[PDB]
């Protein structure tokens, strides 16, 4: 069913995130050696193709999350599903910002422009989700979910600290 | 020095698996 489907999409999002990371760290290693630009551009292309994949999977996650919510109209399930979406968009945000860092080093100005748009859009979606999630925290009485919210919060803080160290 | 356990994709998988099984 759709709860399995949500988890399955999440696995595909995490896998595409991993491809972005793998390409980014190989890109950074290659750029510090002075690798030829065709290899650098390969890794940037790999990040872009995986980002495209993640963007589409997030649209599937989102359209599937919405059906599960509203069909269930359950607070705990909605909170669970928004926290999954909250995690997926964090992974997308990291993936965008890593590709942006690579695009900037390679001087790919049009990709950097497009990634600027994607990162503001994901920031906006993250802030919308934070607003809904904070509302449900009052409404649910499962401290496991409250710990899960605290965890993704600490994930984003560490991810931002990591992103600043890269650029 | 740069590695963050929080960026780990296995951690994200385990976090989903935890969150999903709550």
Residue numbers in the entry:
A (entry chain A): 3 to 169
B (entry chain B): 179 to 200
The authors write:
Peptide hormones, such as parathyroid hormone (PTH), neuropeptide Y (NPY), glucagon (GCG) and secretin (SCT), which adopt α-helical structures on binding their receptors, play key roles in human biology and are well-established biomarkers in clinical care and biomedical research. We set out to develop general methods for designing proteins that bind peptides in helical conformations. We show that by extending RFdiffusion8 to enable binder design to flexible targets, and to refining input structure models by successive noising and denoising (partial diffusion), picomolar-affinity binders can be generated to helical peptide targets by either refining designs generated with other methods, or completely de novo starting from random noise distributions without any subsequent experimental optimization. The deep learning methods largely converged on the overall solution to the helical peptide-binding design problem—groove-shaped scaffolds with helices lining the binding site—that the human designers chose in the initial Rosetta parametric approaches.
As a first experimental test of partial diffusion, we started from our parametrically designed Inpainted binders to GCG (with 231 nM Kd) and NPY (with 3.5 µM affinity). Following partial noising and denoising, we identified diverse designs that in silico had substantially improved computational metrics compared to the starting design. The highest-affinity designs were expressed in E. coli and then purified, and their binding affinities were determined using FP to be 5.6 nM to NPY (top) and below the limit of detection in the picomolar range to GCG (bottom). Both designs were very close to their design models.
